[PDB]
């Protein structure tokens, strides 16, 4: 995205690559629900095993 | 019931599974009547053989 410094002007086609990926880490950060109670996103509230 | 400790949510069936257990321990408290004047539970009043 220094697009050459100003040559790619079709950043805005990577602003939107950057933004899926942003919701990946949205995505995976749901999703690993270990027990409905899922692992690493929001407020999990560090067990003890 | 450390539940991978707060893993297991069902820990709700081991309550009841617990429960059943604690009532076990009325059953095997009664039933032992010999003598009509059962062994261990309740009031035994320490005879003399």
Sequence with gaps: SAN???SDADRAALQKEVAAQQAELTRISDTTTFGGRKLLDGSF?????
């Design 4 to 6: 050459g410094s100003n």
């Design 45 to 49: 509230g560090t067990t003890s095993f």
